[PDB]
Every structure is written in structure tokens, then in C-alpha cells.
Ligand binder design. Structure first.
Ligand SMILES: [Mn+2]
Ligand SMILES: [Mn+2]
Lengths: 92, 92
């Protein structure tokens, strides 16, 4: 429950379907009227290049924005996630 | 002018003194009472590994939080910045 949790879960689930995303580390989303502005950090393979992380972020942004129309702006950026890492996304 | 712009500029200037930071791509900062909560994306060498980007983010977080005491929480994450890129940081 919480419609905002459901929206945040949609964002996370869309992002986690994009190849190269190991998980979503952090998501902050807020309304400006009907539109959402959001900042998301995705976890990526540590051995990737930063150029590769960059292309994954761009793919995440395209996929999320294409699926969640009320999102007017989404910044996607990257950090290392090791593969033994089950840390659930942090929100708020 | 704008005391919030000055705080944001302090954050950017502290971060840009950390080795490996090519620039600050994006900064979002808000007050909860007297404390600041902030999300920052730093630009990093594209040929770096994501593990290296990660260690730069961690160094940025330590340096910024150590210099700006009112910051209670700072998420630092990374993206590619090419070196011909003079793009000024985006705020708000
Ligand atoms: Mn690019
Ligand atoms: Mn680490």
C-alpha cells in the first residue's frame, strides 16, 4: 500500500528489466502537479567501464520514461553493485 | 545571490576538489529543518571502471560531508563526462 510506493515500485521494476542493471540502489521521486521528477541510482557491474555504466543509465532512462508517462524528468546515474548484494532499494 | 545557490556552490566546489571528479553533472539539495539532504551526480573518466567511479563517489561524499556539516545525507553517484565537456552543473 501507498500509491506513491506503487509508483516507485513501477519505476524500480521497469529499471530492473534493463540489461546491465544489477539493482536500483536509490530512488527519489516527487510530484510537480501531475508530473514526476525523479533521481535514480542504479547498481552496475564494477568491472564495467564508466562509459558502459553511462549507456546502461541512458537505456534505463529511455525505458522508464517510455513506460511511466507522468515522469517528466528522470536522472539516472550509476554506482558499483557486487553480485552478493541483495540490498533492497532505498526511497524517500 | 541566493543563499541556497551559495550552499549549492559550496557543495560543487568541495566535490570538484576531489581527484577523479571531472565536474558535477547534477545536484539536488533540500532542507529538512536545519539539515540538508542532497543527491549529486559527478562526472568521471569514461575509461574508469565502475569500481573506480565508486571509490571517487565515496571520496566525494566524505569530503563534502566533512566540509558542510549541515548536510545530514548525501548520495553521490557517477556518470561519464568527456573532457571537452564544460557543461555547468544543473541544480533544483
Ligand atoms: Mn553519451
Ligand atoms: Mn565499496
Amino acid at each position: 500500500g501507498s500509491h506513491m510506493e506503487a509508483v516507485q515500485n513501477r519505476i524500480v521494476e521497469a529499471a530492473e528489466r534493463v540489461p546491465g542493471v544489477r539493482g536500483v540502489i536509490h530512488l527519489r521521486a516527487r510530484y510537480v502537479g501531475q508530473d514526476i521528477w525523479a533521481d535514480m541510482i542504479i547498481g552496475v557491474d564494477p568491472e564495467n567501464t564508466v562509459e558502459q555504466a553511462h549507456e546502461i543509465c541512458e537505456a534505463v532512462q529511455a525505458a522508464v520514461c517510455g513506460k511511466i508517462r507522468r515522469i517528466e524528468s528522470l536522472h539516472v546515474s550509476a554506482d558499483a553493485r557486487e553480485i552478493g548484494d541483495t540490498t533492497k532499494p532505498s526511497f524517500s
